[PDB]
């Protein structure tokens, strides 16, 4: 006989065993420089309505398809009317009294209080200083130093808004010189400030963070928005909203639920529409607030897309290969390419400038997810049977692209009318609904961002099971971290108790293998097992020994929150406790701590990137409290440290014991540095 796993769906419903369809646990091997051109040409495909305007400061032609011609065919179109978006915003604000003003006040508090720290906490970014992708902190330091080398030194006040002011005044300077040194002119600098990678630039990140904070403050006060919440919270927002629909009295209700998704949702959102909806949200607000929040949409309206590495040609006869970058696409003939490459290059030749293509109506994935969710919640709010003025009425939950709708109408004839109205209004605001990856049924069974509802719940949303392997930082820290991660995934990203048991089992196996500490009970011997077996032989109560010292495991579900030392503490030997918990050991030092737990004897271990770190470490060496709490003080680093040094020298010379000449030399060096800081 032949074995077929999917046949199991014949006895068990789909939602009860849907986790069998998800093949991968984590991320599989994936796989460009041409793929960018495909997306660029597709974005300009849904926007070809003669709205070309040649840019004045970048010289790149720009499509402006907003409020253009209406769509005649069912194919996806990116032509959204401005007054429609503004009316959706107005009706959203009418349904929810003054939500925009509260969100705007919260965002004003954010922009007033935000330091430059929030700009370093991020993933890979695009450094224009080196024209390459770099980590967040390194790209930030590169931009800071290249600004400080020129006449741009406003960021040293600590405010992110001052860094944004520096970014503003940078585009006004005619030439920007980069030291490593060579000059760059204003045009190419504008190109580099408004160019993205396959990854935002360094300048746009502050404005995009502020816009995202505003969208977050808006989405927090919306039942129909499911982006800010995650996990069990989402569960409620499903079981609640369905109960607002299915539980209607006098059953004259026909409630149909659609599981939806918007195909090519990302490439149709025009940043000018975002500018419009922000301008309406910042209505009657102070002018500086609008001037700050509106920067990101303007930068996205005039933005370039970096192509990347390039292509590579191979000679079948001469046996020689050559690479061609993206910058050389202008001065080249079209004989060396196959038919598909030529077909893609022809439609993008007049768009590219300085090795980067021009993309006016574009928007990149994962940039304005929450503001896009606000836009979707607008149309979701337009179905309160008061703005439809008809018998059909809908409501639902919105995410970035995956949305779940529930529409009620008095008879089977009116449901399609409501669905068609919803779809056409989505087309009006630039939301192209996917007729392929969507389906309808009766209320009681649907999907929303991998959350499946069939008269019950299953949370296969973030069920990328945790790293069963060791975290690899330390002996006790790794065990505490692994068991705390298992405990967290048992409440946040719901998994069964037996799965958690087996996960702890695999983790303990990987932890005993990683640190060559299995136990003193097994015959297996690593480099370390002799000492472990000597321990096990001399220890009376074997259970008290830690797993890091070759001890037995007694962690289970009930005690995943207790650190290993405290759990086995009662069962330890007095000798073993004294030899383990001794703080006067030559093994540990107060470094790189932290949600981590107890620490014991098994707690062991631009110009130059560490320009800052040296200074910070020395300052911490002068004031230990700075390693715990953000320091407060108006004096400069040098004077504060010198005063600390002088006082410490005085106290450990007068009452303590230190050499008189050593004290003299210390204070001589201190006065030398005091004189040094005069220049």
């Amino acid at each position: 006989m032949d074995v077929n796993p999917t046949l199991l769906f014949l006895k068990v419903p789909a939602q009860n065993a849907i986790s069998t369809t998800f093949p991968y646990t984590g991320d599989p091997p994936y796989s460009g420089t041409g793929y960018t051109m495909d997306t660029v040409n597709r974005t300009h495909q849904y926007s070809e309505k003669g709205k070309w305007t040649t840019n004045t400061e970048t010289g790149a032609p720009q499509l402006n398809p907003i409020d253009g011609p209406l769509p005649e065919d069912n194919e996806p179109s990116g032509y959204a009317q401005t007054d429609c978006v503004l009316e959706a915003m107005a009706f959203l604000e009418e349904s929810h009294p003054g939500i925009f003003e509260n969100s705007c006040l919260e965002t004003m508090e954010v922009v007033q209080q935000t330091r430059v720290d929030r700009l370093t906490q991020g993933r890979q970014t695009y450094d224009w200083t080196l024209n390459r992708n770099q980590p967040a902190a390194t790209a930030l330091a590169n931009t800071i130093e290249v600004f400080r080398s020129n006449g741009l030194t406003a960021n040293e006040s600590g405010r992110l808004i001052d860094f944004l002011k520096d970014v503003m005044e940078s585009m006004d300077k005619e030439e920007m010189e980069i030291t490593t040194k060579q000059r760059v002119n204003k045009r190419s600098y504008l190109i580099r400030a408004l160019t993205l990678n396959t990854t935002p630039g360094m300048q746009i990140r502050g404005f995009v963070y502020f816009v995202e904070t505003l969208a977050r403050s808006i989405c927090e006060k919306l039942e129909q928005s499911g982006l800010p919440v995650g996990g069990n919270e989402k569960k409620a927002k499903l079981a609640n909203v369905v109960r607002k629909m299915m539980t209607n009295s006098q059953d004259t209700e026909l409630s149909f639920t659609i599981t939806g998704d918007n195909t090519k949702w990302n490439e149709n959102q025009n940043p000018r529409m975002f500018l419009a909806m922000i301008t309406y949200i910042t209505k009657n607000q102070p002018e500086w607030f609008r001037n700050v929040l509106s920067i990101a949409p303007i930068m996205f309206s005039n933005k370039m897309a970096r192509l990347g590495k390039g292509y590579m040609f191979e000679s079948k006869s001469m046996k020689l290969r050559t690479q061609i970058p993206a910058e050389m696409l202008a001065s080249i003939d079209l004989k060396y390419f196959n038919e598909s490459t030529r077909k893609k290059i022809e439609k993008i030749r007049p768009l590219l400038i300085d090795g980067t293509a021009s993309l006016s109506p574009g928007m990149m994935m994962g940039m304005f997810n929450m503001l896009s969710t606000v836009l979707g919640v607008s149309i979701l709010n337009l179905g309160q049977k008061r703005y439809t003025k008809t018998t059909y009425w809908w409501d639902g939950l919105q995410s970035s692209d995956d949305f779940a709708l529930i529409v009620n109408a008095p008879n089977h004839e009116g449901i399609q009318a409501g669905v068609d109205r919803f779809y056409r209004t989505c087309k009006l605001v630039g939301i192209n609904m996917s007729k392929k990856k969507s389906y309808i049924n009766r209320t009681g069974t649907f999907e929303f961002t991998s959350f499946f509802y069939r008269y019950g719940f299953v949370a296969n949303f973030s069920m990328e099971l945790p790293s069963f392997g060791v975290s690899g930082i330390n002996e006790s820290a790794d065990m505490s971290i692994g068991v705390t991660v298992i405990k967290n995934n048992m409440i946040n990203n719901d998994l069964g108790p037996a799965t958690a048991q087996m996960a702890l089992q695999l983790f303990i196996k990987d932890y005993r293998y990683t640190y060559r500490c299995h136990r003193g009970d097994t015959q297996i011997q690593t480099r370390r097992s002799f000492e472990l077996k000597k321990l096990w032989e001399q220890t009376r109560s074997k259970a008290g020994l830690l797993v890091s010292d070759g001890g037995p495991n007694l962690y289970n579900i009930r005690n995943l929150h207790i650190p290993e030392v405290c759990l086995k503490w009662e069962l330890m030997d007095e000798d073993y406790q004294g030899r383990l918990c001794n703080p006067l050991n030559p093994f540990v030092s107060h470094k790189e701590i932290e949600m981590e737990y107890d620490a014991v004897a098994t707690t062991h271990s631009l110009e130059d990137e560490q320009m800052y770190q040296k200074c910070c470490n020395l300052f911490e060496k002068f004031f230990p409290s700075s390693s715990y709490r953000r320091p407060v003080g108006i004096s400069s680093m040098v004077e504060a440290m010198v005063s600390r040094a002088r006082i410490d020298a005085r106290i450990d010379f007068e009452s303590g014991r230190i050499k008189k000449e050593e004290f003299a030399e210390i204070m001589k060096i201190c006065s030398t540095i005091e004189e040094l800081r005069r220049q």
Binding site: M1, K509, R558
Partner: protein
Amino acid sequence: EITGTMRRLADQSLPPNFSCLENFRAYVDGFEPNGYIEGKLSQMSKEVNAKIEPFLKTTPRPIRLPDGPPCFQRSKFLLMDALKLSIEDPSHEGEGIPLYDAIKCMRTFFGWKEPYIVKPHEKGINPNYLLSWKQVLAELQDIENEEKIPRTKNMKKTSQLKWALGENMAPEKVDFDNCRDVSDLKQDEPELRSLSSWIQNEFNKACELTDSTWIELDEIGEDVAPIEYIASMRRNYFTAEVSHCRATEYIMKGVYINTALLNASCAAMDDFQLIPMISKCRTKEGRRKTNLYGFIIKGRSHLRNDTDVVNFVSMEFSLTDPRLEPHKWEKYCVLEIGDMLLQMSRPMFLYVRTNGTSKIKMKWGMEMRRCLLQSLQQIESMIEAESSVKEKDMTKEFFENKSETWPIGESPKGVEDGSIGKVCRTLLAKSVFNSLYASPQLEGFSAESRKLLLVVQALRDNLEPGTFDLEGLYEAIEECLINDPWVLLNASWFNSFLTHALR
């Protein structure tokens, strides 16, 4: 402030109805919801609609399958055809040096015939493979001259080995300034391969039980709570039904192989090191056994990035004639290398292939025991979701009750339901095959077929479902079906399911 070169971009970002953005902001400030939505709807064409097309049991048509040349096997190592070479030796593990364990595997076999090669690669230098194998045997027997055993055999930079790893100098790196013009300076979509019969047999063998245990699952503390009792009774029954399965051997094999290769790709960054394919298990009588599936020769491993690829040659033992199914071994070259004592004395073959792997490809395969956890959760969900409607949950009726049978097979044109252990091993082997046969086609197929499955379920619950463009869904499904045997087997499975779902 918004000064020039910034205000200039602001004025060029507004809709094509204004010149200064101040006019736009004043227009937005005073706005009148006079019902522009209804006007724009009255103006829009009536073709723009989400016309619901009903979904009854007649509309589902079985998934189309590609036709063409038979699909070959591209798994990194032999799954059912590989042959073990036991030493039943307690050297007790881990720090144990794997090179001498492999040579004492070789010490236990006799009957090494002169290599008479059988199935060629059909494109490439075939005798170089048997020359490389002879070099392997020679370098193995040539340790007694070294006077110091090396812990790692670094193969000579021989011509056959430079070719088998593709290190022979390729097109040289030049610039376009001097290769501006050559007559042939050109720069490819895959071919459509049809499903073959061997992948189903591979899966069937993957669900079978074996002789050994293949797991060392560590301990868990005392159970002093009812949910702890339930979790233990689930996990230990699963471990008992899954441990001796062949898919567990596959998991451990992949883990050991990828671990050895990645560990060698750090210290052997310059020379061709011989990497043995060693696994370890425990026989039925409770004695630890060390198995050798074959050898692997690694190329240059300057793995700076994670996607950087190192080439290798896998030479694996087998007892299957390639002449039985030659279409399966497209990327394989076969060497009939001996006869072994079985007393049938069947011929022992060596399947040698050249392949390439990256750091991420290796690490996705060192964590293959996730295939266990996934299975457990996809079991545990069914124990909870299907049994959430109960006061005292159904947990001991799921197991311990052989009357409950689940559909897993169709031999006689009819459903052949099996027991619980077959279900556990089927899900385990499915997850494992997804791990090693991982391909983006499989991901796309899962994503697109899950929707069709959910709508089939909504119809089966009599919830009057309907679609918009079923042809679009079918196009998306047919788009990710080209040449992968695993994806095509899953497609045939879904076709069987749709055939046996009253449709």
